[PDB]
Design a protein around this ligand. Sequence first.
Ligand SMILES: N[C@H](CO)Cn1ccc(-c2ccc(Oc3ncc(-c4ccn[nH]4)cc3F)cc2)n1
Ligand SMILES: [Yb+3]
Ligand SMILES: [Yb+3]
Ligand SMILES: [Zn+2]
Length: 607
Amino acid sequence: VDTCSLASPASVCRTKHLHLRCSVDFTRRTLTGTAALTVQSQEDNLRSLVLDTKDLTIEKVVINGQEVKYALGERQSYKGSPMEISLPIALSKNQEIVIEISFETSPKSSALQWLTPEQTSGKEHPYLFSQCQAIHCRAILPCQDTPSVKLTYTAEVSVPKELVALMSAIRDGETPDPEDPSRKIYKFIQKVPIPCYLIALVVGALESRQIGPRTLVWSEKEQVEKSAYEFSETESMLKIAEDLGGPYVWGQYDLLVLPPSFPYGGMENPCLTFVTPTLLAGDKSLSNVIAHEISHSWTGNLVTNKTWDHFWLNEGHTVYLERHICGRLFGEKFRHFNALGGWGELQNSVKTFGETHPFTKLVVDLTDIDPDVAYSSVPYEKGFALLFYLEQLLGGPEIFLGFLKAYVEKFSYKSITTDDWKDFLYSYFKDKVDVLNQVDWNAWLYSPGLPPIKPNYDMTLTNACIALSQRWITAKEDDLNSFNATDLKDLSSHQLNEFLAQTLQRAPLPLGHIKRMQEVYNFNAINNSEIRFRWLRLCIQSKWEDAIPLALKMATEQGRMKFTRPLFKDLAAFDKSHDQAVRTYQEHKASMHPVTAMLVGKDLKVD
Ligand SMILES: N[C@H](CO)Cn1ccc(-c2ccc(Oc3ncc(-c4ccn[nH]4)cc3F)cc2)n1
Ligand SMILES: [Yb+3]
Ligand SMILES: [Yb+3]
Ligand SMILES: [Zn+2]
């Protein structure tokens, strides 16, 4: 049972295809059109079905050319309102019908962000982008909003002729709108069955540049050149991922660089990965996010979690594949460095929530819980830690990569649960069932806090980060002048970030230490969003007032929740910046992404 959906479960009926014909209205901030759902009955004598909707205005529902009866139930908070549709004829098991729903989105659609020209790079055109994961597809169109149902889709999107529409699908042509010569229709086709949370749309003054045989980088004109260089390893990463998980079945692997308000690092929308512009560091140092979104073309998009309770399967395996891709390109010691850093991020999440918090569990019960609120590093890092621990237990990376490939093949185009994964792991490793029977499955899968067993990690690249971090932490005022810019000479940007992350776990440091760090390291000049973020968190937690405008700026000039959310919390926890953080949130709230606004509001306790 998917307790996050109000629609009929896959055991009643299944959506096989969506044909979406819509028009993007920027003056009304509305998406108007028809969603034609080809639904297949799974039961005999099926006379009605229920769909998910959230803030959708419904004009009518047409089945076999005639308007049919429908009713919208009472709203269930973030879940939206159920939409019951009366079928005009009873269906036998396996019978299909097309249900054509005329709908209109609310300007407040939690799935969309409408941007005025001033909120874009070029300042001449408006912009739109969607974010459907996890349960926001219902805020775009009426659907069975559950990863347990996979469907194909075709789309026709009418937009002003000067703009470009893009979707998580193959571009299937374009023409002037016959009903409106000032608009253009962009056509799309997604031939591989996907869960609806993967349906994506972007409309803006977009340009493209080819960066590989099957990859174009899309963005506003001002960011194309920077993006083309930043993500130039995409094809090499696709070839490694193909070697690890089998053929790439999606045809195209495009990347879209979104405006700074994009709430996530990346979103694995099939054919068109969505990335935050905060990845544009100038040196490819944040390319693991691309390796991660590429990996989802197998774990997540081919093998999908049946419900959001089993989401760890999506991220845990993706982070596992991502670290193998980066391990193949830069070495095994680098995979251990990232894996160890990942354990440190799990330590932080477990500390923030508390070691008894149900959100630190690998498998959660999301009944009555908004998935956006449960979202954190736990499914990622705790999931990864389990696979890395199993890898060491079962004979090493080469043996465990054999399981991952067989796992992807076995469950391709399917939605599965933690028990499905576990039976397959036990089946594949039948000659090692004694080893598998030593795993504390109850604690690993269902217990809060840190995992019962910590894997083994090579320390070659981490040693230098811990050594410099410990030198600063143990330093007294008369040791401050022993620090020099030469302390960072043999540290890569990743090692600088791990140095700051280690130091931040012991924050605050004395204000004079933080002041000396800026004197010798000039961390204020670093543009790399990951390093900048940790440095400003260190400054704010260490109570440096000079860092307040810098932190307020980073929290508002970009909207990637990984940075915006903790920056606002740190600023709210510091008495000197508390009123400023609260006022800044209030004035930016209207211009913010609907989910980032809700979550920043909750963290700050501002309604
Ligand atoms: N996917 C790309 C990465 O490329 C980024 N992205 C965009 C949107 C989301 C998203 C994913 C899941 C989600 O809901 C859930 N969050 C956490 C848990 C959980 C906690 C412990 N165990 N399970 C279970 C959940 F259903 C909310 C938002 N992610
Ligand atoms: Yb075609
Ligand atoms: Yb079994
Ligand atoms: Zn992911």
